[PDB]
Amino acid sequence: MDVVIAVGAPLTGPNAAFGAQIQKGAEQAAKDINAAGGINGEQIKIVLGDDVSDPKQGISVANKFVADGVKFVVGHFNSGVSIPASEVYAENGILEITPAATNPVFTERGLWNTFRTCGRDDQQGGIAGKYLADHFKDAKVAIIHDKTPYGQGLADETKKAANAAGVTEVMYEGVNVGDKDFSALISKMKEAGVSIIYWGGLHTEAGLIIRQAADQGLKAKLVSGDGIVSNELASIAGDAVEGTLNTFGPDPTLRPENKELVEKFKAAGFNPEAYTLYSYAAMQAIAGAAKAAGSVEPEKVAEALKKGSFPTALGEISFDEKGDPKLPGYVMYEWKKGPDGKFTYIQQ
Numbered sequence: 001m002d003v004v005i006a007v008g009a010p011l012t013g014p015n016a017a018f019g020a021q022i023q024k025g026a027e028q029a030a031k032d033i034n035a036a037g038g039i040n041g042e043q044i045k046i047v048l049g050d051d052v053s054d055p056k057q058g059i060s061v062a063n064k065f066v067a068d069g070v071k072f073v074v075g076h077f078n079s080g081v082s083i084p085a086s087e088v089y090a091e092n093g094i095l096e097i098t099p100a101a102t103n104p105v106f107t108e109r110g111l112w113n114t115f116r117t118c119g120r121d122d123q124q125g126g127i128a129g130k131y132l133a134d135h136f137k138d139a140k141v142a143i144i145h146d147k148t149p150y151g152q153g154l155a156d157e158t159k160k161a162a163n164a165a166g167v168t169e170v171m172y173e174g175v176n177v178g179d180k181d182f183s184a185l186i187s188k189m190k191e192a193g194v195s196i197i198y199w200g201g202l203h204t205e206a207g208l209i210i211r212q213a214a215d216q217g218l219k220a221k222l223v224s225g226d227g228i229v230s231n232e233l234a235s236i237a238g239d240a241v242e243g244t245l246n247t248f249g250p251d252p253t254l255r256p257e258n259k260e261l262v263e264k265f266k267a268a269g270f271n272p273e274a275y276t277l278y279s280y281a282a283m284q285a286i287a288g289a290a291k292a293a294g295s296v297e298p299e300k301v302a303e304a305l306k307k308g309s310f311p312t313a314l315g316e317i318s319f320d321e322k323g324d325p326k327l328p329g330y331v332m333y334e335w336k337k338g339p340d341g342k343f344t345y346i347q348q
Contacts, residue, residue, distance in 0.1 A: 001042065002042060002043050002044065002045035003038070003039050003042050003043070003044050003045065003071060003072070003290075003296050004044075004045050004047060004068065004069050004070050004071055004072075005026075005030065005044050005045070005046055005047075005070070005071065005072045005073070005074065005283070005286070006046070006047045006048070006049055006065045006068075006070040006072070006073045006074070006075070007022060007023050007026045007027070007046060007047070007048050007049065007073075007074050007075055007279075008049045008051055008058070008061055008062070008065065008073050008074070008075030008076045008081075008082075008085060008096075009022040009023055009048075009049075009050070009051065009075045009076055009077050010050070010051055010052055010053040010076070010077050010078065010081075011023060011048065011050035011051075011052075012050055012052050013052040013053045013054070014053060014177075014178075014202070014204045015053045015077055015078070015202060015203075015204075017203075017230045017231065017232045018077045018100065018230060018274070018275060019050070019077060020270070021230075021272070021273065021274055021275040021276040021279065022074065022075060022077060022099055022100065022275055022276075022279040023048065023279075024265065024270050024272065024276055024279075025099070025272065025275065025276040025277060025278065025279030025280040025281075025282075025283075026046065026074045026279045026280065026282065026283050027046060028261075028264070028265065028268075028280060029279070029280040029281075029282075029283030029284055030044040030046050030283060033283065033284070033287050039286070039287050039290045039291070039296055040290055040291065040294070040295070040296055042296065044283075047065065047068055047070060049061035049062075049064055049065055049075075051075075051076055051077075051078070051081045051085075053077070053078050053081065054081070055078075055080050055081050055084050058076060058078075058081035058082075058084065058085050059084055059085060059088060061085070062084075062085040062088040062089060063088065065089075065094065066088065066089075066092045066094065070094060071093070071094060071095070071296065071298050072094065072095050072096075072097070072286050072298060072301070073085075073089060073094055073095070073096045073097070074097055074098075074099060074279055074282045074283060074286075075096070075098060075099070076098060076100075076101060077098075077099075077100045077101065077275075078101065078148075078150065079101040079102060079103030079105070079106060079148075079149060079150040079153075080103075080148050080149060080150060081101075082096070082098050082101040082106055083101075083103065083105055083106055083149075086106065086109075086111060086113065086114050087111075089113055090111045090112065090113045090114070093298055093299070094113060094298060095113045095115070095286070095298035095299075095301055095302050096113055096114055096115065097115040097116065097117065097282045097285060097286065098114075098115070098116045098117075098118065098282075099116070099117050099118055099275050099278035099279040099281070099282045100118050100226075100275045100278060100279075101116065101118070101150075102116075102118055102119060102120050102121045102124060102150070102154075102225075102226060103120070103121055103149055103150050103153055104120045104121060104122050104153070105149065105153075106120075107120070107322040107323045107324050108322065111323075112299065112302055113298065113302060114322075114323045115285070115302070115305060115319060115323040115324075115325075116323065116324060116325060117278045117279075117281045117282045117285065117312070117314060117317065117325055117327075118226070118249065118275075118278055118325075119226075119249060119324075119325075119327075119329065119330055120324060121150070121153055121154045121157050121225070122157050123329060123330060124154065124157070124158075124225050124226065124247050124330050125154055125155075125156070125157025125158040125159075125160065125161055125225075126157065126161045127161075127247050127329070127330045127331075127332070128158045128161065128162075128198070128223065128225065128247050128330075128332075129157070129158045129159065129160065129161020129162035129163070129164070129165060129167075130161055130162075130165055131223075131245075131247075131332055132158070132161075132162045132165070132167050132196065132198065132223070133161075133162055133165030133166050133167045134165075136167070136195075136196050137166060137167065139167075139195045139196045140170045140192060140193045140194050140195055140196070141162070141167060141169045141170065141171075141194070141195075141196040141197075141198060142169060142170060142171035142172075142173070142189050142192070142194045142196070142197050142198070142220075143155050143158070143159050143169045143171065143172045143173070143198045143200070144171070144172075144173050144174070144175065144185070144197060144198065144199055144200070144201075144209075145173075145174050145175075145199075145200035145201055146174070146175060146176070146177050146200065146201030146202065146205055147174040147175065147176055147177065148177060148201070150200075150201070150227070151177075151200040151201035151202070151227075152174065152200060153200070154200040154201075154225050154227075155172075155198065155199075155200030156200075158198055158200065158225075159172070159198075162198075169198075170192050170193070170194060171188070171189060171192055171194065173185060173188075175201075175205065177201070177202075177204075177205065179205075180208055182208060182209050182212050182213075183212060183216060185209075186209070186212055186213050186216045186218050187216070189213075189218055189220065190216070190217070190218045194218070194220050195219065195220050195221070196220060196221055196223060197209065197213070197220050197221070197222045197223065198222075198223050198224070199222055199223065199224040199225075199228075200224070200225065201224070201227060202227040202228065203227060203228040203229075203230050203232055203233040203236070204232075204236065206222060206224055206227075206228045206233060206237075206244075207228075207232070207233050207234075207235070207236025207237040207241070208236060209222060210222050210236075210237040210240050210241055210244060211236060211237050211238055211240055213240070214238075214240035221243050221244065221245065222244050222245070223244075223245040223246065224244070224245070224246045224247075225246060225247050225248075226246065226247060226248045226249070226330075228244075228246050229246065229248050229273070229274040229275070229333075229345055230273070230274060231271070231273065231342070231344065233335075234335070234342065234343040234344070239343070241335050241343050242335055242336065242337075242343060243334065243335065243336075244334070244335040245332055245333065245334050245335075245348075246332070246333050246335075246345060247330040247331070247332055247333070248274075248330065248331070248333055248345065249278075249314075249327065249328060249329070249330060249331070250328045250331060250347070251345075251347065252277035252278070252281075252313055252314055253272060253273065253276075253277065255313070255314075255315070257313070258277065258313055261277075261280075261313065273344075277313040277314065278314065280312075280313045281312035281313045281314040281317065284310065284311065284312040284313065284317075285305065285310055285312060285317055286301060288308075288310030288311065288312070288317075289301045289302075289304040289305040289308065289310060290304070292304045292307070292308045292310075305319045305323075306319050306320070306321060306323075314327055315327065315328070331347055331348070332347075332348050333345035333346060333347050333348065334346060334348050
């Protein structure tokens, strides 16, 4: 019988673009795995669930997945969704592998079922904080976060690392997700002589801040994390996005092994940027571990994930005892016009 695998993601709402990356990546991997004979001879059946980046709607999705006989979940995107959802999964025989949720808490609760193909924010903040000290040692830095455990958690990790490396911020502020007028904050930063904004949060608020800062005459460079890696950032921010910096893993679209896969996505009308191949890889890890376990039981697949190594679009993947992957670390990107004339993130 079919192996039922769910995609839990923000298919609508502010982060819909990231939902699309996750859906498209997982769907293509399922198609490719099915074409090669499925998982241990069984076809994959995909079910979708839209969390709208809202923890409450996320748990409704989790419940739907349980009811529908889901065995594996690729998702979610937001740590604030994935963390509560993973408890439902853990208590109901479901393995969850997130391609994008980076809050350390996700894999620090001793749950049997939690895995990622992405990194975590203690690693990410360490890289960013060191970068701030290395390149902007003398700058007046504002640390701003979106008041979520993800955003504030990332800002706090970065603050710790920067502080240790000799950079003391002049401002530390929280804003609410969904708020869109930042003029008062921007004015405060101007008066404080801020030239660097570290942003702990996602692309919507980031693009708004970038756009408004430029309009209000604040010359500052925004630096963020992997929450802003979408074309939509440039759509919101406009040309002001140029020079923006952010941390992210190595770009998988650039791996030689993935050239055909990337061309196939584009032939289907999708640009497989950012988390698309992280989602693809999550599916590959599940299939790989199932093959090694000789079983599609989530508990057995989880054990196998923590023992072996498996081929993926991210390169050969293996997992530590907590479910975190052993893959290349974070690097800094800068936003510049790419060969196709569009602003995007390019590794420095």
